[model samples]
Target: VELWTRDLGSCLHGTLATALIRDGHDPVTVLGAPWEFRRRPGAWSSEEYFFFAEPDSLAGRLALYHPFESTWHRSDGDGVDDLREALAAGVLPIAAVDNFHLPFRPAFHDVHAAHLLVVYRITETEVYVSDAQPPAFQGAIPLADFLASWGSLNPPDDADVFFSASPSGRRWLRTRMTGPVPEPDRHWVGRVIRENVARYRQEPPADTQTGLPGLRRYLDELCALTPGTNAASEALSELYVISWNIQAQSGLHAEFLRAHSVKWRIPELAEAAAGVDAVAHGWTGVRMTGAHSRVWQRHRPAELRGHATALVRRLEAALDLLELAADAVS
Candidate 1:
């Protein structure tokens, strides 16, 4: 409950490491925020640092870029902002699989064996153009559709990122914000959320009697943070101890978003969360590495460790319910 890390620097790494490990990813595969910090933007362009660069050998081949950045949307492929550059020129063209190609994996024998192992986090900008490029895709489709198709292309069970993993890969284009602040958690939909977080808190771990702040506290803090988006919320959901997994790291960015909102109180936490809607209205998409990014990035490794420690502490209590399954013979 008390602040564990001296500052944010240490908190996230330690905490996220536990999360990654819990999810079954080799803790080594996770490159903490500090890993991103190793890149000096002044020394290298954002593209160079974002794609071509690597702080550790274990980084996944995929690159991440927020939709708010104009560079990613400006070119066909040659531009630095192009997803191709984002792939660091892996000897293959980066491709976006259509969600229309639902249930994509079975068709993979036809599409696999391409030059590079790849996946996409497509934005509307990638599909639409002002009469310039013929629309590769039309209208907004749920991110779930894209992830289902893209994931189907690779098998995590075999290659994980490429193949053998869940064919419906664990990727999604989360809706994000372009502002400095977060949207309040409220409305007709908002009331359900308030109650949801509230209920989440009210419901104990179903195992142990003491889970600090309980789910109630987490939701209270969550609602207090405001500008909560479904994507961000989903990211937080992965942190749910019951469902943590190796591929789960991609979703943790929301924790950064949540921690950022709480630390800055930029939108001001004292205000009521009613009437809030739309994340882009207040949240900014620009993400930096190390200390320059969000307040959360400033977290110390010690802090990450500390957060991890706390997570396990509370989790132990919440998980008492698991005794039933644990006790049962396989």
Candidate 2:
């Protein structure tokens, strides 16, 4: 089979979209369905990509909801034969791999990081893979290298912290689209926005938070940790990972609404979409500061607080705008 892939500007988005596209589903309709925020404190991983999805949810951490369903299969006893069998059966496997061993990866021979790619074709000595990331490749890689990357302990690397230190267990995903893709109608888009707005407004639990309160608790907890402590480092790193999905989904949802606004002549909807777009932009400051803060290395706790406080204000402002947007469209 020919190499099958889709690049949607992000790893998780690209990979999930690829699988859905291969199965003849619309990426936007599936990816843009669920738009909301959740944070699992102290549960962040070192994988390059991370998402939050409920067990048995088709989106599986990629989207808050999926129109389809999926099953995860782990390779048994070296896994190559299993992957080959899947490919022979016309199933393209989404494999978890480490960058340290994949020659096409920039981190190859330089850094140890956990990442994902698609395996579409297999040969006796090599396996053809597709990676949508920068310096992307779609060709055969030595089988030995693939095996090493697929099954790695992924030891820590100072060069990259967020994506390193996570073991690659040769995991693979098999997703199935169980129903017809829904048309991207204006009404549906409006409903999605409304649902998101309601979720944002709902009161969160005191012990385990959600929405704005959860965000505040996360920031507060993050700031309270001593600078340079392992706890602070991990929390900040996780923030970067978590923020990417939030920002990406928000931006895409905004785009979807804006398109619907023009088609339906809903000016208010367009304005509201911009509000959601701003939320995506606001995430940039929060994620970037957590990623490169001197607070952890230089004990600059004040800077951490400064950035967190500013982000909180940005988030609140975005939420305010989103509320108006939802009402406008609703």
Candidate 3:
């Protein structure tokens, strides 16, 4: 499934997670006070909304997962509110993968515990803050990263009484989400340079041309190739990130693709197509190759899997027509 963030920072909070069924557990709903918003009896405030599907019940425990799509959106002080809106909106822009929900912060934290104890069990964790600009993370380590690095903090015991007793566990849901960019002061320039060469490289070089005539224009020409590739290239150039996530989930790094958006600009598509299409015109290309497929399938979420499926069908038909068009034009 493919996942798109309304705003970027919220993507981390809405990240996909997984579970494995244990021998004795009977599909337990991994209970946590992390934000769970389904507008009903009692509701909370938020600025954005998002949609996703969880296994009906939590039976097993395994590594959690989610897609890290285009991470160019900026992070702000109001990020948590924006995140709440994004998670709560749950509007499905695509198709079947549109079942939405709001998984708040408090609920997620609670779920991490064995029995609502709000404990963290991982051995080592690294939290990275990302935004639109090069060197997007303002702080070396964000507040969230500090919380994780120092220790797992439990809520006040008095608050625990009501928190533990409630069927709906909510100690700190609907809270704002933000950084683990280390504090700039704490990181020496030498260490910073050594650790973040990739980020440094992601920046657009101010001087891309050597005094050769049109050297500047040539760089621009490469950049103007196509809208989709243009966007991908820009992202890679700016973030040192790329389209390899579809083949591997080991990294929390974001992945993006620059494929044909709609009709592949093929005229023959007029024959195969009947209705008003969603995207602009474009020439058809081949279905993604195995290498491309691995990157997509691996990096994208299962929910967004349908998007690639639909998009590919259009590509195939468009390409078929393109071949015919080429014959005529030739």
Candidate 4:
């Protein structure tokens, strides 16, 4: 495990980055390479829905070979054997486990929510893991405890409605890098930047809400929400869930741009990177707002509207600067 914590990105991205770096891939290149915002027209986990990026988005157009594939297997099946095999093949495996059963987790015995861990070394009776998230840990725990967390159903909990509802802790993602990655070059940077800028300028017709138009549409619905509507409250929860991906993307992308600016010595690229970082910060406004509105206030669509509007405005400003930076590189 690289134990590479970025202070951003969700556990999934964090754990994956830990594995990717261990596999000789640049963490930023794999995680920060994509920079597009897409939202489907329903109330699903955006993280889950977009976990598999759309083919036409930057992820699709650029052909980033994410060598790791996240395939779910029954916890009762050969999950342990599969993990052992993957590790023997020089791959670090990411496992989704419920926080309730993990002693090292802050939510230990308190929150039955799903979380990610990077399994570095596994023995018959103990498994060593790394969690880059807060209260981070790296060490071995009893096999029974680790397996208990790994196989947990992650049952519904009042403490964590947002993450608790995701699929149970019956999943493991295997990562092994065997192929070459296209080097990140100025020309490639130009193409990806222009592509994301176009995406932000406006929304395009699709099966889902996307782009600026989709942002407006989603916010419109959110703004119109009234108290006592189950739909309204649930949508608020969904808002918190979906925003994580966008927040993670903006934060990591900002880091990528900032790092590359120094590498390529482009001052303007770093400046634009600052702008994107603001979007990540701006997302906090929306997610926290939605979380508060749903969990406690339970009656404030108006505030959600304020945050939503600010996020889009924040994105638009950065996107303009991104287009300029892309031109500099092109």
TM-score of each: 0.22, 0.88, 0.18, 0.90
Tell me model 2's lDDT, rounded to 2 decimals.
0.72
lDDT of 2 by residue, 1-330 (tens): 223223224566666777777877666667766667777555567776676554435355454445566576778787499988888887778888999999998888899988888888888999888887777688899999999999988998888777888888888777666666566665556667667767776677765456766777877887888766777777778887777767777777766667767877877767767776666766776677677762346555676677667666766766666566556655
- Residue 151 of model 3 has an lDDT of 30
Off by over 4 Å in 2: 1-9, 55-61, 294-303, 327-330
Best of the two (1, 4) by TM-score: 4
Candidate 2: which pairs clash?
A: none
Q: Order of candidates by lDDT, top first?
A: 4, 2, 1, 3
lDDT of 1 by residue, 1-330 (tens): 011111212222232233233333323222211111111112221110122223312123121211111111223322224443443432111232322243223333343311111222335333210000111122333445433343444422221111122232222111121333222222222232233233324435433221223423433332332233443333232222111211122233223323333544523211211111111111111111111212232423343334444443433332332222222211
Model 4: colliding residue pairs: none
Estimate, for each residue in 1-330, the C-alpha lDDT of model 3 and write its tens digit.
Answer: 122121222222222211111111111111110111111111211111122212321111111111112111222442233333443453111100000111223333332210111111212342222221112221123434433312332333322211121211112221111222122221221232222222212323343311112222322342333423534323222211111111111111111100111324433323322211211111011112212322232222232234334433443443343334333323
Assess candidate 2 and give its TM-score to the true structure: 0.88
lDDT of each: 0.26, 0.72, 0.22, 0.73
Of the candidates numbered 1 and 4, which has the greater lDDT value? 4
The prediction achieving the highest lDDT against the true structure is 4
The C-alpha stretches of model 1 lying farther than 4 A from their native spots are: 1-153, 157-164, 169-194, 205-301, 307-330
> Model 4, poorest ten-residue lDDT window?
56-65
Off by over 4 Å in 4: 46-70, 167-169
Once model 4 is optimally superposed onto the true structure by TM-score, how far is the C-alpha of residue 131 displaced, in angstroms? 0.7
